Amino acid sequence: MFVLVEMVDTVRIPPWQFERKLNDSIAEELNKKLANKVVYNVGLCICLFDITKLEDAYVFPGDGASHTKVHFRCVVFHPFLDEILIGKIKGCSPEGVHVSLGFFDDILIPPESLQQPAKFDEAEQVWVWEYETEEGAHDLYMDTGEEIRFRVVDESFVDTSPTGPSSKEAPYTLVGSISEPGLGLLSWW
Amino acid sequence: QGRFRGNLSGKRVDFSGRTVISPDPNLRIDEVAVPVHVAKILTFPEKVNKANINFLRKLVQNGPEVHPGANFIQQRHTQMKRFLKYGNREKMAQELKYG
Amino acid sequence: AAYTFNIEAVGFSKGEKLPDVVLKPPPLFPDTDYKPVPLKTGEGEEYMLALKQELRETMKRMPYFIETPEERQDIERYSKRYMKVYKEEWIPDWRRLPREMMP
Amino acid sequence: GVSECIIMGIPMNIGTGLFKLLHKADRDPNPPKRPLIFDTNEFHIPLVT
Amino acid sequence: KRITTPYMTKYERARVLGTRALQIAMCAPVMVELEGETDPLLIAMKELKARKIPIIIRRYLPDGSYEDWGVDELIITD
Amino acid sequence: TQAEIKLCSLLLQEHFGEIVEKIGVHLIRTGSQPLRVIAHDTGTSLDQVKKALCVLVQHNLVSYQVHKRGVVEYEAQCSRVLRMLRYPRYIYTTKTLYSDTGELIVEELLLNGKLTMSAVVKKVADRLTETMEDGKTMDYAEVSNTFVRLADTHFVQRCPSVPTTENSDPGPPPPAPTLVINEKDMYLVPKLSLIGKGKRRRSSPIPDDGIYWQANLDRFHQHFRDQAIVSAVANRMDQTSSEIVRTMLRMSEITTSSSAPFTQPLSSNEIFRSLPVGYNISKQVLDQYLTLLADDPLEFVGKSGDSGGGMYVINLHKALASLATATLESVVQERFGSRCARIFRLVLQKKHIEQKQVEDFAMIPAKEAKDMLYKMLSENFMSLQEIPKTPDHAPSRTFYLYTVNILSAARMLLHRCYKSIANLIERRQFETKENKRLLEKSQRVEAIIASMQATGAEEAQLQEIEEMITAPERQQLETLKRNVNKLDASEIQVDETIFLLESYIECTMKRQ
Amino acid sequence: TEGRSRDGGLRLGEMERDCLIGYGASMLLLERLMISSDAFEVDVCGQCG
Amino acid sequence: MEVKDANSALLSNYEVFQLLTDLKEQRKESGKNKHSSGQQNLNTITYETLKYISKTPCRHQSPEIVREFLTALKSHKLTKAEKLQLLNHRPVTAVEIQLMVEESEERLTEEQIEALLHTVTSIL
DNA sequence: TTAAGTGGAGCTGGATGCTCTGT
DNA sequence: TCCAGCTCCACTTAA
RNA sequence: ACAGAG
């Protein structure tokens, strides 16, 4: 469910790490800078996959540290449109169902894409699903997070940059769906 | 007295001195005798590393008034200079980290 | 206070009645004494108005409206044939066009 | 030019600024790449004609 | 092949000792055995005499091409 | 011409797209360029340059001439792209003068640039199936009967054609075929015995190949020049005085050029037979009008002759100057009041006048006239002459004579109009773009009605259309449509000021 | 500042700049006239310049 | 920093399981330093991502299991996104294959669907 | 006869060394 | 206090 | 603005 993303970067290696092989010190430095962060158009970077080309290690005037331009590939959590995933619930709200996916947490199942025989709760947070023969209006979405299976239909990138001079919105949002037959909890299907 | 000649191509600098001169042939041809009144004011920022730590601890312990001494001290990733005339210099010499 | 220039060459021979000091800047939109003349109506002036808005919707649909080509599509899927934007392509008279313009 | 390197505060080109220095680190350019397993080209002939 | 001069110039010598002294001033490893030296420039000159400095001098011709000379293979002189 | 390049940047975007205006504006802004540098200086792919050039050489917007070493350079016509704004005025003036078939003939030519006669008589007759019903198709005779009547009146002209390579330069093919105009057969139509019926869009070799027809924009501007002069006489003297002016200019359609200060002189003996016979006027009363219209100091007409009874000419360049003055003085009143337009008519008549004579001659006192003088030098309606006593040119020893120049104020007033239309398009495209959530929501409730209109369309789909939350939102969509209909209409009416200004600026230029 | 009364500091004039060029000293001419007089940083928009 | 390619290649979640495990073998020999939170944001996203993978049916696989799962599925005329999801979740019934294959009742016959159930579960 | 291209004469705007040491 | 550019004006050739 | 010094 991932994509590799090919990137270029200029990495500063300070001179107290000249005892160590440069291929190891670059990989430690790029994981200190790209891990657990959402790059804007490509998504959430997990870790470095490999280094593919390693150019010259210049030393600029005014510094003793070696600067080198690095070509590399990074593994990125970025699910494509209309993909089927599995994950747990964080809880319930009138705004929707909050689905947890391990490391990642911002997955909104909207009320317009819920399964249709229940669409609104009885002034309660926990969402229901009314089946006629069994479990009328009480089949609940538990906050403890039993495993569900959902289908991503929308993803959005908001540019969390400073607007104005210096002297927390969710940047990588994801909208799933459950209304297809076969989606939902792993018990139901 | 404009910008280009007066303030850009040539400008006033610090870490500089100016005195009357006088001869001395007992020195070499590549040495110069700096007075001690100017050697205490002028400073060179020496970084702490493995080769000079025992030397710089003693130069901190002398302080700003005895001649092989130090006028300031700066922490590793801080931009603020502790003026070394005050405080106990035996404590700030023990806390010399690398960098 | 006295200036560098002579005030008497500017004016102010009496020595009084100097202009007041602007405390707050003028507004962005100073109000107008006069108004727009209202539009001309009639059965001729309104048919041209009706014909104009029909030309926007027409010329946006004609194949001379060269849209920009799409790119950076992520994956392939079977629903591409269902999402294929079909439109007939116009070909010029190459006898009138220069030779350097063949595709 | 030399006179506007002195104004803009970048080091000039004549003298010791004519050449660039490289650090001789223990580096392996083009290290052995990790092989992909799923998205190889021999198993994914496209669907459309 | 390499067609430029094999003698290290005074500018190459000066900037190599300068950059090596700035590296030894920070906590970089020293390639020679120091014997009580505290000034980093003196340790740089001991590394220069023993031909151990890990710097490659890249010489840019005015057209854009270059030549990578090692420090340990230029003829040092006074 | 920054206002022209801004306004042409919008007319190419609305009518052709975005990757064509970058080619189109760059040809207007810089000059005639070969093909390889347009892809360089703009940055598009070389294929998209060829698409953008073939759509601009189609609509007669860019030209091409061969230069040294056989390269082809493309030169845009900035005046031609601004005439894309006058398209709804062109389709209406062929509806008054010609039938609704001729309304569609001009429309297919203005929307395709160049068409063959065989293609346009098919496409008009196909589109006129919607306008008719009950078994009556449109046939190719009565379409072509309207078509050849246009070429007799020069509203449709032939394009410059390809040269005959069998007569001129056989052998190696040139990079560009170097087209040339032929004066004889611009209006000599090809004969078409082939007839047929317009298909009603049921959805279930060419003898004039190369003979392309285009709209003659210079003919309409000769026609619009008439109604500016004819309806000016209709307001001043009389409607019978106006039809005589209408009669002479209709006779002067084929016999004079479009740029002539004095037309062909017509004798009063043959105006009398040329007038429509519904006017109960004699020959002597006809001579009474021609001697009182000659008594006008505005000189719309003149005598200019003695032989053949009453010889008379009607003026062309001097009639535009009386209109461009009335164009320029209509805005002085509406912007600065009626008492300020008194001065602008005063300083125009007495050609060089000072402050003290204006306050006397116009009966407007000091400190109220001088405010109306000083707000016009800052708006460039009026200038000073500044006759000095010394070569020092000191302000305390000289005389400042006010002067109204018609030509410099008319070029200034035209430059305001180009920016005035560009602001109207920018306000409309702003309110169209910010309601893209409203219009698509109103489109989706209409798409349930539009899709499945007859086949399987039950009656239980008419109540779920107003049921969506767009029901209080219709207040804004009606506030939208009352805004778009006013800004589109004001976009058209400013073109009336442009044509009265641009004709005066064009006719005063000798172009040596 | 200027003089001995104001704790001034000395002047690398126009002529002493010309001597440091002749030695080819690039980083010393950088240290005297940028690092130890008036070093500063600015925020520059790379789009509008 | 700059990006040369947005979507280079599609990754099965087995390839990440082999990646994060072999990353762990050289990790946790040097702990975090509190010189920056770079070692903090690395450790949280590495441990928790492998735990999500360690409940998926991508465990117990090999390269050559994936090399033969694409070999048997070569002659079924499916897209890359439709061949990927059959490996990550291991479909076992024919209801979710109507989700993983678009227009599944129109491209694939009911026997062709039911043979695909036998193809997945016998390899995986 | 005069249109024009180029000489010679007058007007204009620029510049004139490096630092400290005091009133 | 000394010195290059810029502009004005007679002075031949050429038609 | 003036005087010094090299």
From Swiss-Prot, chain E:
Location relative to the cell: Nucleus; Nucleus, Nucleolus
Gene Ontology BP, a term: transcription by RNA polymerase I
Record-level GO cellular component terms: cytosol; fibrillar center; nucleoplasm; nucleus; RNA polymerase I complex; RNA polymerase II, core complex; RNA polymerase III complex
Signal peptide coordinates: none
Chief location bin: nucleus
Molecular function GO terms recorded: DNA binding; DNA-directed RNA polymerase activity
Domain of life: Eukaryota
Keyword Acetylation in record: yes
Sequence similarity: Belongs to the archaeal Rpo6/eukaryotic RPB6 RNA polymerase subunit family.
Function: DNA-dependent RNA polymerase catalyzes the transcription of DNA into RNA using the four ribonucleoside triphosphates as substrates. Common component of RNA polymerases I, II, and III which synthesize ribosomal RNA precursors, mRNA precursors and many functional non-coding RNAs, and small RNAs, such as 5S rRNA and tRNAs, respectively. Pol II is the central component of the basal RNA polymerase II transcription machinery. Pols are composed of mobile elements that move relative to each other.
Name of the protein: DNA-directed RNA polymerases I, II, and III subunit RPABC2
Organism: Homo sapiens (Human)
Name of the gene encoding the protein in the UniProt record: POLR2F
From Swiss-Prot, chain F:
Residue ranges of the region described as Disordered: 160-180
Entry keyword Phosphoprotein: yes
GO cellular component, as recorded: cytosol; nucleoplasm; RNA polymerase III complex
Entry-annotated residues carrying Phosphoserine: 193
Keyword Manganese in record: no
BP GO terms, sorted: defense response to virus; DNA-templated transcription; innate immune response; positive regulation of innate immune response; positive regulation of interferon-beta production; regulation of transcription by RNA polymerase III
Protein name as catalogued: DNA-directed RNA polymerase III subunit RPC3
Subunit structure: Component of the RNA polymerase III complex consisting of 17 subunits: a ten-subunit horseshoe-shaped catalytic core composed of POLR3A/RPC1, POLR3B/RPC2, POLR1C/RPAC1, POLR1D/RPAC2, POLR3K/RPC10, POLR2E/RPABC1, POLR2F/RPABC2, POLR2H/RPABC3, POLR2K/RPABC4 and POLR2L/RPABC5; a mobile stalk composed of two subunits POLR3H/RPC8 and CRCP/RPC9, protruding from the core and functioning primarily in transcription initiation; and additional subunits homologous to general transcription factors of the RNA polymerase II machinery, POLR3C/RPC3-POLR3F/RPC6-POLR3G/RPC7 heterotrimer required for transcription initiation and POLR3D/RPC4-POLR3E/RPC5 heterodimer involved in both transcription initiation and termination.
Recorded name of the encoding gene: POLR3C
Span of the signal peptide: none
Transmembrane stretches, start-end: none
Swiss-Prot record, chain G:
Annotated residues for binding of Zn(2+): 45, 48
Cell compartments where the protein resides: Nucleus; Cytoplasm, Cytosol
Residues binding DNA template strand: 4-5, 11
Superkingdom assignment: Eukaryota
Family per similarity comment: Belongs to the RNA polymerase beta chain family.
Stated role: Catalytic core component of RNA polymerase III (Pol III), a DNA-dependent RNA polymerase which synthesizes small non-coding RNAs using the four ribonucleoside triphosphates as substrates. Synthesizes 5S rRNA, snRNAs, tRNAs and miRNAs from at least 500 distinct genomic loci. Pol III-mediated transcription cycle proceeds through transcription initiation, transcription elongation and transcription termination stages. During transcription initiation, Pol III is recruited to DNA promoters type I, II or III with the help of general transcription factors and other specific initiation factors.
Protein name: DNA-directed RNA polymerase III subunit RPC2
Gene (name only): POLR3B
Curated annotation (Swiss-Prot), chain H:
Annotated GO biological process: defense response to virus; innate immune response; neuropeptide signaling pathway; transcription by RNA polymerase III; transcription initiation at RNA polymerase III promoter
A GO cellular component entry from the record: DNA polymerase III complex
Tissues where the protein occurs: Ubiquitous. Most prevalent in testis.
Keyword line: Antiviral defense, Cell membrane, DNA-directed RNA polymerase, Immunity, Innate immunity, Membrane, Nucleus, Transcription
Keyword Transcription among UniProt keywords: yes
Membrane topology listed for this record: Peripheral membrane protein
Molecular function as annotated in GO: calcitonin gene-related peptide receptor activity; DNA-directed RNA polymerase activity; nucleotide binding
Keyword Nucleus listed: yes
Primary location recorded for the protein, binned into one broad class: nucleus
Subcellular location, record wording: Nucleus; Cell membrane
Domain of life: Eukaryota
Family: Belongs to the eukaryotic RPC9 RNA polymerase subunit family.
Protein known as: DNA-directed RNA polymerase III subunit RPC9
Full protein stretch here: 1 to 124 of 148
